[PDB]
Amino acid sequence: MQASQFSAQVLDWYDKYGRKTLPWQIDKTPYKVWLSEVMLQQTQVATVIPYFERFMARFPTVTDLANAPLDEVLHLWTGLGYYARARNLHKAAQQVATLHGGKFPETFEEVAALPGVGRSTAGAILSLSLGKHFPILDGNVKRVLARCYAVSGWPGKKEVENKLWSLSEQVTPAVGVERFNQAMMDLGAMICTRSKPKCSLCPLQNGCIAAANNSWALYPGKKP
Ligand code: SF4
């Protein structure tokens, strides 16, 4: 499907059905988007929301998080699993307090230099909170693009992951990037699911190659 048609259909879909009232979209900031991206990495949204709210009440700024004892951070994380995320979260807050005056960095290289933050998390923080023109590629997004454009192969191989980053760059627009990147997370979470995707509710169904051939189970490829 042509890229300009892809982005316009995703944006029109988000206008009419999209998630717009999550706590981190009210009065968005880079701090709020970073905290939400780290909690969502290995946890589903319904579980994350109460934890996000308790972390913003206790730590209203990144300096408050940096100055707190690591044990108080681990105690509030209890129940989220995957505690390396919490240890990296605290070190990253200390780096922002120490190197950047307590203000969350706004350039890609400085954001991705934080522990716990990779290439997709960095572009999510800067596109969603400030409107910068960066694409994302988490597991939800990988599945939508690999099925729409029939990208087989395991994304654990570099050549395959690079093909997926190039497709995400191509379909991600500059006008409406904040809406588009949230919409691709929503589609991958709620519509183009791992098992039996809901293609009749998908705004890409008229041009998706997997839907034309009922071949969604081939994309992305699995570990060989
Ligand atoms: S039409 Fe179906 S397989 Fe294609 S992107 Fe949408 S939900 Fe996924």
Whole-number Å distance between alpha carbons of 114 and 161? 22
Query: Could you say which architecture CATH assigns to the domain 21-132?
Result: Orthogonal Bundle (1.10)
Whole-number Å distance between alpha carbons of 211 and 87? 42
Residue 189 token pair = 């979470």
Domain ranges within the chain, ordered by starting residue: 1-20+133-224, 21-132
Question: Residue 167 carries which side chain, given as an amino acid letter?
Answer: L
Give distance in angstroms: CA of 143 to centre of ligand 1.
9
Whole-number Å distance between alpha carbons of 122 and 181? 13
Element (H, E) at 109: helix 108-112
Mutate to test the pocket of ligand 1, among 152, 204, 209, 219 (most ligand atoms within 8 A of CB): 204
Q: Which residues are annotated as a binding site for [4Fe-4S] cluster?
A: 192, 199, 202, 208
Rama region for 58: left / alpha / beta (φ>0; ψ in -120 to 50; rest): alpha
The answer to whether the beta carbons of residues 140 and 197 sit under 8 Å apart is no
Element (H, E) at 142: helix 139-148
Residue 19 token pair = 């998630």
Q: CA nearest 65: which of 82, 84, 89?
A: 89
Annotation says 110 is catalytic? no
The answer to whether the beta carbons of residues 216 and 202 sit under 8 Å apart is no
Rounded to an integer, what is the distance from CA 113 to the centroid of its chain? Answer: 17
**Topology given in CATH for the domain delimited by 1-20+133-224:** Endonuclease Iii, domain 2 (1.10.1670)
Place of tokens 């972390």: 55
Give the C-alpha distances (Å, rounded to integers) separating 29 from 10, 23, 68, 106.
24, 11, 21, 11
User: Rounded to a whole number, what is the distance in angstroms from the first to the last CA of the chain?
Assistant: 28
Whole-number Å distance between alpha carbons of 102 and 43? 27
Those residues with Cβ within 8 angstroms of residue 219's Cβ, 6 or more apart along the chain or in another chain: 143, 146, 147, 150, 151, 152, 210
Give distance in angstroms: CA of 202 to centre of ligand 1.
6
Q: Which residues are annotated as a binding site?
A: 192, 199, 202, 208
Place of tokens 């105690």: 75
The answer to whether the beta carbons of residues 127 and 175 sit under 8 Å apart is no
Give distance in angstroms: CA of 35 to centre of ligand 1.
29
Q: CA nearest 177: which of 125, 107, 105, 116?
A: 125
- Tell me if 10 CB under 6 Å of ligand 1: no
Residue 12 token pair = 């029109």
Residue 138 token pair = 């988490």
- Tell me if 141 CB under 6 Å of ligand 1: no
Q: Do domains 1-20+133-224 and 21-132 have the same CATH topology?
A: no
Question: Residue 13 carries which side chain, given as an amino acid letter?
Answer: W
Give the C-alpha distances (Å, rounded to integers) separating 18 from 119, 180, 181.
25, 10, 11
